[PDB]
Amino acid sequence: FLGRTGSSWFKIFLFYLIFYGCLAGIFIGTIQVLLLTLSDFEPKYQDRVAPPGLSHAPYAIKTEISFSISNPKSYESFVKSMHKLMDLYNESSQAGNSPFEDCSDTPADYIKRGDLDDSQGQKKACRFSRMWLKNCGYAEGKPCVVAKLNRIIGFYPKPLKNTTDLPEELQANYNQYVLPLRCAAREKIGSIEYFGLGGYAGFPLQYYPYYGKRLQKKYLQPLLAIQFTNLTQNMELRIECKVYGENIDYSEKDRFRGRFEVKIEVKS
Amino acid sequence: LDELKKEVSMDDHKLSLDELHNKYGTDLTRGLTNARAKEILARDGPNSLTPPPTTPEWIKFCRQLFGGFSILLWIGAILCFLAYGIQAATEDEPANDNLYLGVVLSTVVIVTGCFSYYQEAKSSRIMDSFKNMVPQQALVIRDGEKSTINAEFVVAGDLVEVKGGDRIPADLRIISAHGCKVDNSSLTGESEPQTRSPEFSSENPLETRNIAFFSTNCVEGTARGVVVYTGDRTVMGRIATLASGLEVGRTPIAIEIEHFIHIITGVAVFLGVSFFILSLILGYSWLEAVIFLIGIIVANVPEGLLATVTVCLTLTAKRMARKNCLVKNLEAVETLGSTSTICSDKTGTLTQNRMTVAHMWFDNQIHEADTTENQSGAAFDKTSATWSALSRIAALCNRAVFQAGQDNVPILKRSVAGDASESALLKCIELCCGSVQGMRDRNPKIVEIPFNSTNKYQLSIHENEKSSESRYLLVMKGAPERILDRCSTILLNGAEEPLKEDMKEAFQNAYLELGGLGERVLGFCHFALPEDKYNEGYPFDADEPNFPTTDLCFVGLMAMIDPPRAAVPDAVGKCRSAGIKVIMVTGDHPITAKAIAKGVGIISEGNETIEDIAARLNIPIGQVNPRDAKACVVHGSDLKDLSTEVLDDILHYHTEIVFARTSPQQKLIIVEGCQRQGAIVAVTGDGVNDSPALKKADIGVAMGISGSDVSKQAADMILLDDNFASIVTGVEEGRLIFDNLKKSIAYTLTSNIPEITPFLVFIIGNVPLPLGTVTILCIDLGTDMVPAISLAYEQAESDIMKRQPRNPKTDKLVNERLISMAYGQIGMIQALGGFFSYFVILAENGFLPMDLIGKRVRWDDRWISDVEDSFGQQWTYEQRKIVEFTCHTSFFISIVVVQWADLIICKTRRNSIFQQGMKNKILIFGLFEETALAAFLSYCPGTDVALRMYPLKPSWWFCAFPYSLIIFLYDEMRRFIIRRSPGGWVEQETYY
Amino acid sequence: EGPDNDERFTYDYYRLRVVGLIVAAVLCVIGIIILLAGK
Numbered sequence A: 001f002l003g004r005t006g007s008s009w010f011k012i013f014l015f016y017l018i019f020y021g022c023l024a025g026i027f028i029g030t031i032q033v034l035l036l037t038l039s040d041f042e043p044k045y046q047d048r049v050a051p052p053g054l055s056h057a058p059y060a061i062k063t064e065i066s067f068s069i070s071n072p073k074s075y076e077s078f079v080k081s082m083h084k085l086m087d088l089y090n091e092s093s094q095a096g097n098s099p100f101e102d103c104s105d106t107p108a109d110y111i112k113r114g115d116l117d118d119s120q121g122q123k124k125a126c127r128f129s130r131m132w133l134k135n136c137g138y139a140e141g142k143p144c145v146v147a148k149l150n151r152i153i154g155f156y157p158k159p160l161k162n163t164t165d166l167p168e169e170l171q172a173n174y175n176q177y178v179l180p181l182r183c184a185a186r187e188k189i190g191s192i193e194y195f196g197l198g199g200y201a202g203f204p205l206q207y208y209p210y211y212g213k214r215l216q217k218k219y220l221q222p223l224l225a226i227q228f229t230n231l232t233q234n235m236e237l238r239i240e241c242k243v244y245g246e247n248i249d250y251s252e253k254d255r256f257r258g259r260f261e262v263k264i265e266v267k268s
Numbered sequence B: 001l002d003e004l005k006k007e008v009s010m011d012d013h014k015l016s017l018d019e020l021h022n023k024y025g026t027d028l029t030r031g032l033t034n035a036r037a038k039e040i041l042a043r044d045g046p047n048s049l050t051p052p053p054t055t056p057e058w059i060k061f062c063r064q065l066f067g068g069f070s071i072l073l074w075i076g077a078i079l080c081f082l083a084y085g086i087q088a089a090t091e092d093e094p095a096n097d098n099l100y101l102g103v104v105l106s107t108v109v110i111v112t113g114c115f116s117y118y119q120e121a122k123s124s125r126i127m128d129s130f131k132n133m134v135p136q137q138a139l140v141i142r143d144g145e146k147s148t149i150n151a152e153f154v155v156a157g158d159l160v161e162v163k164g165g166d167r168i169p170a171d172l173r174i175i176s177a178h179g180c181k182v183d184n185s186s187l188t189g190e191s192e193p194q195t196r197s198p199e200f201s202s203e204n205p206l207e208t209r210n211i212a213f214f215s216t217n218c219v220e221g222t223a224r225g226v227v228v229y230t231g232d233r234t235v236m237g238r239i240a241t242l243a244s245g246l247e248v249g250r251t252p253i254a255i256e257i258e259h260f261i262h263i264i265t266g267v268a269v270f271l272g273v274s275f276f277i278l279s280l281i282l283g284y285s286w287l288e289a290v291i292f293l294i295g296i297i298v299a300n301v302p303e304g305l306l307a308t309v310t311v312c313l314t315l316t317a318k319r320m321a322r323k324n325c326l327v328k329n330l331e332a333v334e335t336l337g338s339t340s341t342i343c344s345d346k347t348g349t350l351t352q353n354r355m356t357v358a359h360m361w362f363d364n365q366i367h368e369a370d371t372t373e374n375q376s377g378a379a380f381d382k383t384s385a386t387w388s389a390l391s392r393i394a395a396l397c398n399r400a401v402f403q404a405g406q407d408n409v410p411i412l413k414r415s416v417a418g419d420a421s422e423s424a425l426l427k428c429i430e431l432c433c434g435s436v437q438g439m440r441d442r443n444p445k446i447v448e449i450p451f452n453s454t455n456k457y458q459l460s461i462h463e464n465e466k467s468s469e470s471r472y473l474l475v476m477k478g479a480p481e482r483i484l485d486r487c488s489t490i491l492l493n494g495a496e497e498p499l500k501e502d503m504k505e506a507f508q509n510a511y512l513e514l515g516g517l518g519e520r521v522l523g524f525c526h527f528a529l530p531e532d533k534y535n536e537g538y539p540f541d542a543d544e545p546n547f548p549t550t551d552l553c554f555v556g557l558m559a560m561i562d563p564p565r566a567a568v569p570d571a572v573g574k575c576r577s578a579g580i581k582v583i584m585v586t587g588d589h590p591i592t593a594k595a596i597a598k599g600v601g602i603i604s605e606g607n608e609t610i611e612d613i614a615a616r617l618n619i620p621i622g623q624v625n626p627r628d629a630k631a632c633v634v635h636g637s638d639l640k641d642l643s644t645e646v647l648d649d650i651l652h653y654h655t656e657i658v659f660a661r662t663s664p665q666q667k668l669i670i671v672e673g674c675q676r677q678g679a680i681v682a683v684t685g686d687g688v689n690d691s692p693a694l695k696k697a698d699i700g701v702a703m704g705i706s707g708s709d710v711s712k713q714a715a716d717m718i719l720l721d722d723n724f725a726s727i728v729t730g731v732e733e734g735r736l737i738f739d740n741l742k743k744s745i746a747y748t749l750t751s752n753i754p755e756i757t758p759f760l761v762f763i764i765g766n767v768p769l770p771l772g773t774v775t776i777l778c779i780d781l782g783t784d785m786v787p788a789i790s791l792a793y794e795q796a797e798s799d800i801m802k803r804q805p806r807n808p809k810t811d812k813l814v815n816e817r818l819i820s821m822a823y824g825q826i827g828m829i830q831a832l833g834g835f836f837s838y839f840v841i842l843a844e845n846g847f848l849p850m851d852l853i854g855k856r857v858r859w860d861d862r863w864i865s866d867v868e869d870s871f872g873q874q875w876t877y878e879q880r881k882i883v884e885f886t887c888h889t890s891f892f893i894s895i896v897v898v899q900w901a902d903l904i905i906c907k908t909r910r911n912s913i914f915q916q917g918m919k920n921k922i923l924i925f926g927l928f929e930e931t932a933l934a935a936f937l938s939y940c941p942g943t944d945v946a947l948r949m950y951p952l953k954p955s956w957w958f959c960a961f962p963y964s965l966i967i968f969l970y971d972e973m974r975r976f977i978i979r980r981s982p983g984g985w986v987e988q989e990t991y992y
Numbered sequence C: 001e002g003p004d005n006d007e008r009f010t011y012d013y014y015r016l017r018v019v020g021l022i023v024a025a026v027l028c029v030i031g032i033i034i035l036l037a038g039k
Ligand SMILES: *[C@@H]1O[C@H](CO)[C@@H](O[C@@H]2O[C@H](CO)[C@@H](O)[C@H](O)[C@H]2NC(C)=O)[C@H](O)[C@H]1NC(C)=O
Pocket: A086, A087, A088, A090, A092
């Protein structure tokens, strides 16, 4: 033929069949032992998610949400993702004492449901009403963005203490139980309005620590609705929403490390 | 074009002096007119040689920039700029990826260009050396007056004059001469002075006395002649053009390189476009379809391989430089290993090029002297009183002297003023009797008759050094038979005795044997003149026989020859044991050529020519079956009337071939004949008459000390110490580097698979990219470099000089067996070890292997800063990318770890590491430096930006260890099978 | 610890780099030693 005879062509096939078969069987074996060394409830390493990311619902083309108020299908793209998220926070999804629980309607302290063990059933998560998100189809004019803190197993988000000076200096400082979120731009051509649990501009600490998908399915993380009823129009406004805390940090590279990058433009 | 120049020349030495003048419109006495000479100048053109048109270095460099790998790397470099252009227009990408990767790849092409350019070097100044043989000026007779003119202004027809010490300015017809002798070594390779006279003495113009040639010099006397040829039209000017004009051609090693380039280029374009369409079918945007292709290019092309080859060659050439063997062309480092036929000059190559005493006949006994340079033999006789009598004649009846200031150099190497035979005798006595000058001071010469054409003897009368005599001793030497007709007694073991027919017959026997050995034989005799008949003041007349020259006492015979170099016989046998055919090709006479052939082992004992059979059986040569003769001796005059097909039959039908009295073109023809049969041929030589053959040879080797400038220009290799044993070393080195290149190539190729497979699974699996493009270049250009080079220092696995020369048609540098092992077996195991570490990193950070399938869509989505892992955690864009790049880093390090084992297995093709050992210090160096480089690239701060290399946790380093070990075991088991059964299965499938 | 389990999300990449570079250097020196056993 090309290389060899039929007899040789066969033998080279019988070899590579057994050979690659063995190699596949060995590869699988090493994957088995790897998995055997891992927990079902907690990942081996968590230093790469460490400082929590802050992500929002409006799917930004490039950290930007520009549209026209005087146009219907101009914002119907951002309403798709906005709906996708809030559709999960339905009351019909949170039914019965299992696996949900009614928690303080005001920001409270942490809740420990034991260890990362299966020695108990599904760890009961705090309910969250999308109805706590006042004012927010969504904002056809002047968007109503929804913030979110990235989930990390066993992470206890710790707010800053009012020992020294603060950006939003001491205003509504629920020091003990709220992780604040203050959006900014100089360039003050807007109108910041925050909505959340208990009416505070933060995340209620009663939703922590997260016990993971395996130990807490259907779990709901707290949301923080933000509305920009800015009196300006037809210009790119670089708005940055920042979260503050002891366990919260940022990076010049990762522009989502505990903060937002939104470029709103109501070009109408 | 040069087929005309490969033919024997035609001449006009047969014409009379007068007749020759009519042909050139010339005067025998007055010479040309100033006006007629200038007319002929403009007519024929200058008496000069024009160098052939060369290829500029520009085109030579750029021709390498387009050879398979460079072509693919160019397509990659441009395709980078393509994707970059498409980006800069569509979505403003502030990145530098495609732009920088395009710059990097273009640089890789340029630098790789320098390496191949350095390897494909051609240092040739043939025509320049020939031009150096034309004198600046010549002496001509114009308008009846002699004047010096620019030699280029010399034309056919003018009257030229030459004298001892000057170069022949052009081909001349001798019309007048006085004691003129010439050095025709340019045409023959033999430096013994040849007389020139107006008389025609041979039909063959290269042998007649009435022609003098350009490229030669007058050694003594004076001559006048008419110019018959000028410039390019001279006999050796044509040889110049032939030699300088010959197409170089591709080396065996070069052909091998291009061959695997085709193979690897083939699989590259195959998988390249095979997966380019496979991606579009899967619905991949052309934006991405090209990005994957660039990666495929980088994965398939072994970026550092061609440069490795060059470095391995260079390092092998450095070792040979350290044995006095200079390599002018890097590729010639290997040709000697692939050589199946050596065509060797005799004089100054196989031989020392110096008349040396070989045997002596005295006391009715043949004695042998030591002919070797360094005198590696033993003594023959010292005791016999006869010896001292013969020794005295050899010293006394000798007019040769050592040049001043030689006392530092060895006797046999020092320059001597005199003819070759007298120098030989001088050096013979000086060696075994001490200072000859002393013997010539103790015995003052009073009268002598120098060797005469008519007398055929030379005699001398000396004052006997003996005090009790202080009388007159007569000594003489000459033609053995002439000396015999002048002897009455023979000095036997001390005492004289009558010359009976018995001893006279033993003389003839001794004389015939020595002459049969191709040796020049001389007779020696002396006579103690009677005291009473010769007073202490008796005057001797040299002009008229004033003393007896008959009834003298015969002392002995001495024989001499230009002997082989000490190492030559043994080197010839070694070449022949390695299955290399050795042919002699010489301008010298057949009797001498044949005798040295037997001396060095070109013709082995018992082997006969058709002429030998005929003489032994006493029958006509036509009655001899030529197939009964494995040896042959072909004279150039017969070679001339043979067609190439008939030359091919001679080459095919004889194992032991001697081509004697060959011209320079004839040497070229013999070389081409050998090549025509498909053989790789080496030429060894030292003369300008070797230049065409040396050029045409696959590898030409010139002698460094004895070699002429031309020969060393025409060669690929120079033996700087004239050590012929270096050929044996060269062939051995050549074979070793050929095997080691295979090892180094397999090693380099093996790591291509773990660079290809990640890109494929990226498409077919939709998982995060396991390894990056930059990461690949860190391997092929970084870590693999020193290890790959180090394989060039591997010792032989067996006695390589015991095997036959490779068949260049069947035995390739890269074959299917190499690809099967490197791509199909070992590289495949490396790929898995890479993937394993990849799955380990991701799974330990929260992304278990199961959830990875079909996630790249969301993984690469820059706007999703919340991807969910297996444990329900959310990752931003840059966070997961850090883990991904950490995966690139550990996959990279996994390659390094699996290359550890590969380096050790590529060490040997057959033998076990437990047999070959770990005595390669460069290899071990490679292991340490490779690992140091990898660690540095991972842990050095800032490398995460420039190369996207991230720090690895200690446990990460050990992921591929079980795969590294399986490689070592697998290959060790496999080679154990090879050795345990030379049959073929494992052998014919995987044996590189 | 409980709410004070910050060490769980921390890794000393600084020490690892220091050690990694020490090792790389020493492997580089060791290599020179073995190579220079004859040049
Ligand atoms: C989650 O809540 C949303 C609230 O808008 C539900 O949307 C409803 O969709 C139905 C049918 O398309 C409409 O008739 C209603 O007007 C919507 N709102 C309400 C309050 O009922 C959505 O269907 C819910 N999703 C799930 C899975 O239950």
